[PDB]
Enzyme design. Structure first.
Site, short mmCIF file in Angstrom:
data_model
loop_
_atom_site.label_atom_id
_atom_site.label_comp_id
_atom_site.label_asym_id
_atom_site.label_seq_id
_atom_site.Cartn_x
_atom_site.Cartn_y
_atom_site.Cartn_z
CG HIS A 141 -22.16 -42.95 -10.90
ND1 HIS A 141 -23.48 -42.73 -11.16
CD2 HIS A 141 -21.64 -43.71 -12.10
CE1 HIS A 141 -23.85 -43.06 -12.32
NE2 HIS A 141 -22.58 -43.59 -12.85
CG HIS B 88 -23.15 -45.30 -16.36
ND1 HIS B 88 -22.66 -44.32 -15.81
CD2 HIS B 88 -22.70 -45.07 -17.70
CE1 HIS B 88 -22.19 -43.51 -16.56
NE2 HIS B 88 -22.14 -43.89 -18.06
CB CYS C 292 -27.19 -43.98 -10.54
SG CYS C 292 -26.32 -43.94 -9.05
#
Length: 118
Positions: A18, A30, A108
């Protein structure tokens, strides 16, 4: 190294990484993982909104949890990073926008690399 505003953060999860953008004072921006599984409630698994994710400002500690993480600006060897003023104003403008959270798509990562590099 301790993160500075504009830094990319790579978080080691189980089976994937991530990514987040550090903006200072212990905050990141994010593409937040979704909390509703495909086909939750009335929705079909085949809904275009399955795995919809929201751009969020959250505490670094909350996003990392117990996971290992590092600053990873190694794309700076290929692309010139933008001024931190522009990275952070761009990041803040995206808060509340949505993208598909497809781990295979690496969205992401692409979300925050576009903030740093344009």
């Amino acid at each position: 190294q301790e993160p500075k505003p504009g830094d990319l953060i790579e978080i080691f999860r189980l089976g994937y990484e991530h990514w987040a953008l550090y903006i200072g004072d212990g905050y990141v921006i994010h593409l937040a993982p979704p909390s509703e599984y495909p086909g939750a409630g009335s929705s079909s698994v085949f809904s275009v909104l399955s795995n919809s994710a929201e751009v969020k400002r959250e505490r670094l500690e909350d996003v990392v949890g117990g996971c290992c993480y590092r600053v990873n600006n190694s794309l700076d060897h290929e692309y010139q990073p933008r001024p931190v003023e522009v990275i952070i104003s761009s990041a803040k403008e995206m808060v509340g926008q949505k993208m598909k959270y497809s781990i295979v798509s690496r969205n992401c990562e692409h979300f925050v690399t576009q903030l740093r590099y344009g």
